[PDB]
Amino acid sequence: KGENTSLLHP
Amino acid sequence: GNIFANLFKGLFGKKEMRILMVGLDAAGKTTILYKLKLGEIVTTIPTIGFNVETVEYKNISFTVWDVGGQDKIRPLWRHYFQNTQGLIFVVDSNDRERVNEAREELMRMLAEDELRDAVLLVFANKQDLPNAMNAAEITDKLGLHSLRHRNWYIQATCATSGDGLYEGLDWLSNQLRNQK
Amino acid sequence: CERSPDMLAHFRKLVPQLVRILKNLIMSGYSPEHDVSGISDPFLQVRILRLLRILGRNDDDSSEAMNDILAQVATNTETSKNVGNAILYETVLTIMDIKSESGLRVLAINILGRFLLNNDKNIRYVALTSLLKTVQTDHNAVQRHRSTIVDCLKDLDVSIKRRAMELSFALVNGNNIRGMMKELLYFLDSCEPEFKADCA
Amino acid sequence: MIHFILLFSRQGKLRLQKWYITLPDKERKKITREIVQIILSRGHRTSSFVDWKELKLVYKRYASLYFCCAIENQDNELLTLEIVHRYVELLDKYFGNVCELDIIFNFEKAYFILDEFIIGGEIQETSKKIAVKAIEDSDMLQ
Numbered sequence: 001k002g003e004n005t006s007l008l009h010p
Numbered sequence: 011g012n013i014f015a016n017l018f019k020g021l022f023g024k025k026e027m028r029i030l031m032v033g034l035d036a037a038g039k040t041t042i043l044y045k046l047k048l049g050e051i052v053t054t055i056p057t058i059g060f061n062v063e064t065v066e067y068k069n070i071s072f073t074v075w076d077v078g079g080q081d082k083i084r085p086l087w088r089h090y091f092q093n094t095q096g097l098i099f100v101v102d103s104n105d106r107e108r109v110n111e112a113r114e115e116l117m118r119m120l121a122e123d124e125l126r127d128a129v130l131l132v133f134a135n136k137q138d139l140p141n142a143m144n145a146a147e148i149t150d151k152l153g154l155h156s157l158r159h160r161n162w163y164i165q166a167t168c169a170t171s172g173d174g175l176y177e178g179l180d181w182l183s184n185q186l187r188n189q190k
Numbered sequence: 191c192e193r194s195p196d197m198l199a200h201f202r203k204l205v206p207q208l209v210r211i212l213k214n215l216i217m218s219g220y221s222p223e224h225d226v227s228g229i230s231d232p233f234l235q236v237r238i239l240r241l242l243r244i245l246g247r248n249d250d251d252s253s254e255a256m257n258d259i260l261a262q263v264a265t266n267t268e269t270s271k272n273v274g275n276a277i278l279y280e281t282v283l284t285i286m287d288i289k290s291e292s293g294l295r296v297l298a299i300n301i302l303g304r305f306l307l308n309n310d311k312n313i314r315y316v317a318l319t320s321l322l323k324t325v326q327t328d329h330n331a332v333q334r335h336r337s338t339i340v341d342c343l344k345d346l347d348v349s350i351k352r353r354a355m356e357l358s359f360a361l362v363n364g365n366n367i368r369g370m371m372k373e374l375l376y377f378l379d380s381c382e383p384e385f386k387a388d389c390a
Numbered sequence: 391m392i393h394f395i396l397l398f399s400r401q402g403k404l405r406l407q408k409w410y411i412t413l414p415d416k417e418r419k420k421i422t423r424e425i426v427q428i429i430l431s432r433g434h435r436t437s438s439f440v441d442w443k444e445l446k447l448v449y450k451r452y453a454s455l456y457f458c459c460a461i462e463n464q465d466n467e468l469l470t471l472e473i474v475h476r477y478v479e480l481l482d483k484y485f486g487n488v489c490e491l492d493i494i495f496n497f498e499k500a501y502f503i504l505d506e507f508i509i510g511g512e513i514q515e516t517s518k519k520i521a522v523k524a525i526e527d528s529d530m531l532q
């Protein structure tokens with residue numbers, strides 16, 4: 001996928 | 011778990027609060043602490059070490075730890091910063107030469123990561139002579155308005171008269187205590 | 191001020207006010223709002239630096255008034271984060287573009303040299319851009335980075351390589367032209383297809 | 391000021407687009423395609439800075455969807471990266487765990503946040519809490 005991941009991971 | 015005992019204690023007053031006594035030497039810090047605790051202007055010897063006392067007002071025991079403004083005691087203010095919740099800075103509006111030193115000491119104290127949760131408590135000491143500045147000129151000179159993330163309040167208090175100490179204590183209680 | 195120069199004199203009277211505002215902002219290094227990566231009001235600091243660089247660029251009074259602020263910012267700012275590096279680069283650019291003191295120019299040159307050795311691609315590009323902008327100004331001081339400029343041509347970054355080539359082209363003088371001719375020919379012979387025409 | 395800011399995914403799909411310069415639709419599409427090709431044809435050690443068409447084409451994506459900016463050669467390069475990071479943080483705070491799927495569904499919200507943050511390519515809200523509070527108040531109006 002790779003879309004549900006947070007843009008900054010915070 | 012049950013918090014019935016805590017609620018019962020808080021119903022009649024349980025919060026105490028804290029306070030600190032810092033500033034330049036001969037800035038009325040000891041006199042301010044004596045007025046807060048006792049209520050009289052008593053002459054004392056220079057604070058070579060530190061003064062420990064407690065003041066109870068509005069059902070809150072705001073203990074004040076006097077710290078001298080001496081060179082040998084200026085770097086010792088970090089020792090009293092541990093286990094301290096409040097800090098009151100006494101400015102010397104009648105000492106123009108020492109005003110810069112007091113501002114630098116306040117900036118150094120406020121520029122420490124350990125002393126971050128303590129709100130600024132600027133007291134305009136020596137507010138009894140015409141040379142003393144107002145509640146805004148002293149703050150502007152000390153840059154109290156630029157202390158971001160710090161609740162700094164400028165109050166003018168005269169050691170001889172004692173006026174403004176109640177207002178400063180109420181402001182400190184409001185800043186610390188956020189209850190009805 | 192940038193649109194027309196008639197308001198430069200009128201807008202130059204507020205130089206002390208801008209200097210005082212910048213000093214107050216620098217003094218308040220901590221703030222819940224606008225404080226990102228340890229820099230409080232980075233946008234405000236960048237705007238102040240840009241105004242100082244563009245204000246009094248051809249006058250001594252404007253540069254002298256902001257000289258102390260520039261000196262304090264060049265030493266009271268940490269470039270560990272991206273905001274600090276950007277602020278330092280903006281201060282260096284303002285000092286170079288204004289009639290600053292010899293010490294300010296030396297500090298800007300040292301900062302540019304230090305940022306040139308940084309392994310970050312963005313930092314290297316910023317250093318190359320600063321060196322290219324400060325080509326005519328402090329040209330003698332830019333000659334100390336001839337080795338860095340030559341090495342930047344062989345860098346694995348297209349932007350970095352272009353910046354290094356531009357710096358080498360702008361640093362060619364009447365004495366290093368003969369020496370730099372061989373380097374330019376070698377770069378053109380072994381350059382990228384999009385840079386071979388530019389190199390020629 | 392920022393000439394145009396567009397958020398494009400790794401596969402080339404564009405999740406956001408905001409150009410501050412009036413350009414033809416065909417010309418704008420060609421420029422966007424060229425920017426996507428340059429970003430899609432650039433490595434991770436290129437410094438995230440490209441001088442395309444005399445514009446500081448700064449590409450810096452913290453996730454699969456990347457972001458691109460186009461500013462004139464009159465300001466520091468780190469300022470654009472700082473502004474992009476601040477905008478990303480503000481969007482994440484406004485939404486909460488912002489992902490690629492949420493960006494597509496919240497395209498109107500993202501556009502409103504971008505408009506309330508930067509207008510005309512220039513910074514309009516230096517603070518991060520004031521802009522968030524204003525966006526929340528505008529959303530609560532209905």
Ligand SMILES: Nc1nc2c(ncn2[C@@H]2O[C@H](COP(=O)(O)OP(=O)(O)OP(=O)(O)O)[C@@H](O)[C@H]2O)c(=O)[nH]1
Nearest residue numbers: 035036037038039040041054056057136138169170
């Ligand atoms: N007489 C008088 N003294 C004042 C007044 N306001 C501030 N002071 C100062 O308060 C000081 C009282 O001395 P201390 O009890 O030792 O308190 P301090 O100012 O913190 O001095 P140190 O404890 O040595 O740091 C005097 O030396 C004055 O300089 C005032 O209105 N009248």
Ligand SMILES: [Mg+2]
Nearest residue numbers: 039040057076
């Ligand atoms: Mg004392």
